[PDB]
Design a binder for this molecule. Structure first.
Ligand SMILES: Cc1cc2c(cc1C)N(C(=O)CCc1ccc(-c3ccccc3)cc1)c1c([nH]c(=O)[nH]c1=O)N2C[C@H](O)[C@H](O)[C@H](O)COP(=O)(O)OP(=O)(O)OC[C@H]1O[C@@H](n2cnc3c(N)ncnc32)[C@H](O)[C@@H]1O
Lengths: 133, 664
């Protein structure tokens, strides 16, 4: 019912290897030639990516920045209100990046800040200007 | 039990055969009880003969030892016995006539060839009170059961193996004739061209692949019905090439999709690095920016403060994107190192591997005595169903004693080449010459002629035996279609055993696939220091046109390579077979050629009935009968098959001319 395990031979294949006197060599010489073509391609991406790995020497260790601990205070100093409005214009609604900019305020206080000072700071107008980008 | 007898007589113990339906149509169409009785009566009689086959089993003797309820019907027992005795299932071979043989001879039969089929028919026909004479071209009986004998040296150049006593009639003959039977140890180490033994891990690999490839063909023939190609029948050799090609193809299909996985990832990585380099460049300049904004020292207005804080968030943000990317770069970096160290199979079979494969092919070309390119893919293994159980043996004293034992007490004209067979409505005329001087002409007249001419003889063109009138188109066509093969033997007589005497046989791997069979197998079978070297497949016919000395040379070399140049002395005496060259054989045994089938073996056995001498006269009796190894569909190319065919025709002939009184 099934061919002996580890012996492959499908109805499809056998015909292709039987259609002509040299057909068996012809198909096998295709795969032989096709395998070298894919083999040469492999060398190419190895060479290409060996290059792309030199450009990444040193990683980004020198461009990295130290981290600062920062206890989330809930008071809004007049300065850090102003950082918020500029952030809003710079980012729009990335509540998280905005929280990162102030550095002492978390997304919630960040988030409802948009509502407590919505009138007083013309936040819609700021966001409207931020849309155009 | 009694049931062992039915098996040993090649008969299903629990149902009636087509044979018996013919002689006992009442019992088979009859109630299932009367059947069971019969089959027991059969099996038990078969038993009684079998237990001691050195004495005739007379009907009276049978009935005595049978007990009721079964010995109540004396006519059944008499019918059963007479049927068994007719068709040589009992009282065949070399028994001791209890009743000395009545000289009231009825009928005259001429048997062509003193071969084992011929020998067996002649004893049966004579056993049945007929006048039998055997005609014989050679100056010895046996035909293809030849046996070399010079001094202490003994070695058959014909058959040497008894394939199993499990249901083998040779079993009975080995008790009637003192045949010294020795088993054949299966272990056979292979030695390559250089002379070094194939390593065990390699041996087992190739052999397994061999059987693997043989299943492959069978699946391809039965399931895929790959049995015609270009309006030609497919041979086993073709179907093997196709299977090997498709395995060599699969090897490549595997490497192709392996590297395709590898280059998919390289490309997938190469596009990762591109993001990495561009992002790093971006990070590079955004640093400078954050730095320049940091340099404007405080006190600063909120926009200048915002610009430090935000270029700081911005640069950390890109520092996380690029951090996650070398997290992913590591994730593909090892995968490429894995798949490169998980490569699939380099080849399907190496040059050295295949050379070992060929020996398994040479061994298989010897078993069928023909190049695998000629064997029928569909049918070459149809006899491989009826195999006997037990292990294959050899005959230490030479297989020549069997024929000679049979030839006792028979009219055998040796040096008598039959040359025209002439059969008509009123009888037959066989015309033979003397072989030594073809001058002397002989005319033999008889009621029937039994032809055990080798198939290769029947094949010969122009014909070496003329049939008058000619054999009909259905019988000749069968003869063309069938395969007659060729397998040669070289016998090496030495004064000292320098081989492993616990190895019955060892092989030699040939250099190329073209000469795979040139002396690819050796046998240590005898008490005297003798080695036999086989020549199979394509090599066989090619080597018949080559000087013996040369052949023994190539032999010597091979052994020297295997055992060292100083351990192998010149052989004292040497012989080499040239079976296809022999004109009384013109081959070794029949094979199931492509385009042939088992049906042809049955064609070969149907007897010929001539046309009426006077038009309008009634249908005549059959006069030409055929036996011989090519005539027995179930057990061809074997000594037992020849024998059974001989027993068979003697049963057929006798029912025809003495009458069958056992059908009431
Ligand atoms: C030549 C040769 C023949 C055989 C062998 C070797 C050789 C070199 N044997 C082998 O190594 C292995 C073969 C084998 C083994 C197992 C299996 C097997 C298969 C399936 C399952 C299990 C096992 C298959 C094969 C060998 C063997 N038979 C055996 O069981 N044991 C063996 O181990 N085999 C075959 C055996 O050898 C023959 O099959 C049988 O011997 C033939 O007997 P017949 O055909 O009845 O009779 P004839 O043909 O012998 O005699 C003809 C007479 O006609 C005369 N004649 C001609 N022309 C004229 C004329 N014009 N006028 C007057 N007379 C004429 C001729 O001169 C001779 O007088």
């Amino acid at each position: 019912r099934k061919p002996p395990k580890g012996m492959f031979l499908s109805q499809e294949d056998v015909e292709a290897v039987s259609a002509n006197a040299t057909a068996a060599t012809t198909v096998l010489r295709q795969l032989d030639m096709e395998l070298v073509s894919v083999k040469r391609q492999i060398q190419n991406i190895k060479q290409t990516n060996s290059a792309l790995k030199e450009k990444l020497d040193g990683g980004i260790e020198p461009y990295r920045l130290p981290e600062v601990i920062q206890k989330c205070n809930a008071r809004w100093t007049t300065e850090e209100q102003l950082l918020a409005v500029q952030a809003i214009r710079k980012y729009g609604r990335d509540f998280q990046a905005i929280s990162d900019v102030i550095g002492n305020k978390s997304v919630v206080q960040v988030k409802n800040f948009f509502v407590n000072y919505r009138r007083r700071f013309n936040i819609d107008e700021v966001l409207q200007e931020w849309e155009a980008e | 039990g009694v049931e062992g007898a039915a098996f040993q007589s090649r008969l299903p113990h629990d149902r009636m055969t087509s044979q018996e339906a013919a002689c006992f149509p009442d019992i088979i169409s009859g109630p299932q009880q009367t059947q069971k009785v019969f089959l027991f009566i059969r099996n038990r009689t078969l038993q009684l003969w079998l237990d001691n086959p050195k004495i005739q089993l007379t009907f009276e003797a049978t009935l005595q030892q049978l007990e009721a309820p079964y010995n109540s019907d004396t006519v059944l027992v008499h019918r059963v016995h007479s049927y068994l005795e007719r068709h040589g299932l009992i009282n065949f071979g070399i028994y001791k006539r209890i009743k000395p043989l009545p000289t009231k001879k009825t009928g005259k039969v001429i048997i062509i060839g003193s071969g084992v089929s011929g020998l067996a028919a002649a004893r049966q026909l004579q056993s049945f009170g007929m006048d039998v004479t055997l005609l014989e071209a050679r100056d010895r009986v046996g035909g293809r059961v030849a046996t070399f004998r010079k001094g202490n040296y003994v070695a058959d150049l014909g058959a040497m193996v008894v394939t199993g006593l499990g249901g083998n009639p040779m079993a009975v003959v080995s008790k009637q004739v003192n045949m010294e039977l020795a088993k054949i140890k299966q272990k056979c180490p292979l030695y390559e061209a250089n002379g070094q033994a194939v390593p065990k891990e390699k041996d087992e690999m190739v052999e397994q692949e061999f059987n693997r490839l043989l299943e492959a063909t069978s699946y391809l023939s039965h399931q895929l019905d790959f049995n015609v190609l270009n309006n030609k029948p497919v041979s086993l050799g073709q179907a093997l090439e196709v299977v090997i090609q498709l395995q060599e193809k699969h090897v490549k299909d595997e490497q192709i999709e392996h590297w395709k996985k590898i280059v998919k990832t390289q490309e997938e990585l190469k596009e990762l690095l591109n993001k990495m380099v561009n992002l790093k460049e971006k990070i590079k300049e955004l640093h400078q920016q954050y730095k320049e904004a940091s340099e404007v020292k405080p006190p600063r207005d909120i926009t200048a403060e915002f610009l430090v804080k935000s270029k700081h968030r911005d640069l950390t943000a890109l520092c996380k994107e690029y951090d996650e990317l070398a997290e992913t770069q590591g994730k593909l970096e090892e995968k490429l190192q894995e798949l490169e160290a998980n490569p699939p199979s380099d080849v399907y079979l190496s040059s050295r591997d295949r050379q070992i494969l060929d020996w398994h092919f040479a061994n298989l070309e010897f078993a069928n005595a023909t190049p695998l390119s000629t064997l029928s893919l569909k049918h070459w293994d149809q006899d491989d169903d009826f195999e006997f159980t037990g292990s294959h043996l050899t005959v230490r004293n030479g297989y020549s004693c069997v024929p000679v034992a049979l030839a006792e007490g028979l009219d055998i004209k040796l040096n008598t080449a039959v040359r025209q067979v002439r059969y008509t409505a009123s009888g037959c005329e066989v015309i033979a010459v003397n072989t030594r001087s073809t001058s002397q002409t002989f005319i033999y007249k008889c009621d029937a002629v039994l032809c055990t001419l080798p198939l290769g003889v029947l094949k010969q063109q122009p014909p070496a035996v003329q049939f008058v009138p000619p054999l009909p188109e259905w019988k000749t066509s069968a003869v063309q279609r069938m395969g007659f093969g060729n397998l040669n033997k070289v016998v090496l007589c030495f004064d000292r055993v320098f081989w492993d005497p616990s190895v019955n046989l060892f092989g030699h791997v040939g250099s190329t696939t073209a000469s795979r069979g040139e002396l690819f197998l050796f046998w240590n079978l005898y008490k005297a220091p003798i080695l036999l070297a086989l020549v199979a497949g394509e090599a066989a016919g090619i080597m018949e046109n080559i000087s013996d000395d040369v052949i023994v040379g190539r032999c010597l070399a091979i052994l020297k390579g295997i055992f060292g140049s100083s351990a192998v002395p010149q052989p004292k005496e040497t012989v080499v077979s040239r079976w296809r060259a022999d004109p009384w054989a013109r081959g070794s045994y029949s094979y199931v050629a492509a385009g042939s089938s088992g049906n042809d073996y049955d064609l070969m056995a149907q007897p010929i009935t001539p046309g009426p001498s006077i038009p309008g006269a009634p249908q005549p009796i059959p006069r030409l009968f055929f036996a011989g190894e090519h005539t027995i569909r179930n057990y061809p190319a074997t000594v037992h098959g020849a024998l059974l065919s001989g027993l068979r025709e003697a049963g057929r002939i006798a029912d025809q001319f003495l009458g069958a009184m056992y059908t009431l």
